[model samples]
Target: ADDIVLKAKNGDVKFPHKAHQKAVPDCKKCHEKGPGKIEGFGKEMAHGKGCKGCHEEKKKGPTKCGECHKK
Candidate 1:
């Protein structure tokens, strides 16, 4: 699996879903099932709060803006 580009106003986010999957076995950790799945505007918070929180908790992954944000 390659990188997933999440479009944003500032810039596009390169979401390393495969990389994340290595650490997160369960997709539900970030992606909610049914209509609650993270998408659209929800992606911002999901990536910022949800993703970064786990990275911060585990002390792994990239928490800095430049790490994920690709101009």
Candidate 2:
């Protein structure tokens, strides 16, 4: 399982791609542009529009910045 870490001005987050894959069965749920193409979007768009959207809709995952970016 490959780990995807994201760093921004706020902090850094260690995103366990494997864990997410297990939680979310569909790749299309996060990878709109395609697998491994999420880098194309900026931090705001990716986190706010992508991650936050799912976290909000699911009412489960981390939505707070501190929850994800502890560093």
Candidate 3:
């Protein structure tokens, strides 16, 4: 689990998984089911507190389209 390049209709999202691990380290924030890979994890979760929402909270991560969504 390093940088996860997720394919999207808009573009590809390079998720810095390990980087996030260093920041939060709680695991449960995303791995609610358990401390493991999230199956079928995509837009739904990423847009919520999973990714986008949390970034908004911290005001330190990417929240803009050009920031996260890369062509």
Best candidate according to TM-score: 3
Error of 1 at 26 (Å): 3.6
Which candidate number has the best lDDT?
3
Q: Which stretches in model 2 have alpha-carbon errors above 4 Å?
A: 31-39
Residues 1-71 of candidate 3 have per-residue lDDT tens digits of 35668898898888877778898888777665763446656688788776799999987799998888898
TM per model? Answer: 0.66, 0.73, 0.74
Clashes of 2: 0
Off by over 4 Å in 3: 32-40
Ranking by TM-score: 3, 2, 1
User: Per-residue lDDT of 1-71 in model 2, one digit per residue for the tens?
Assistant: 56877776678877778777888898777666655554466776657756777777778788887888876
lDDT, each prediction: 0.70, 0.73, 0.79
Query: Cα deviation in Å at residue 61, candidate 1?
Result: 1.0
Q: After the best TM-score superposition of candidate 1, give how far the Cα of residue 23 lies from its true spot, in angstroms.
A: 1.3
> Per-residue lDDT of 9-66 in model 1, one digit per residue for the tens?
6678777666777888887876665674444445556476556777887889888777
Instruction: For residue 61, give model 2's deviation from the true position in Å.
Output: 0.6
Query: Clashing pairs in model 1?
Result: none
Candidate 3, run of 10 with poorest lDDT: 31-40
**Candidates ranked, most accurate by lDDT first:** 3, 2, 1
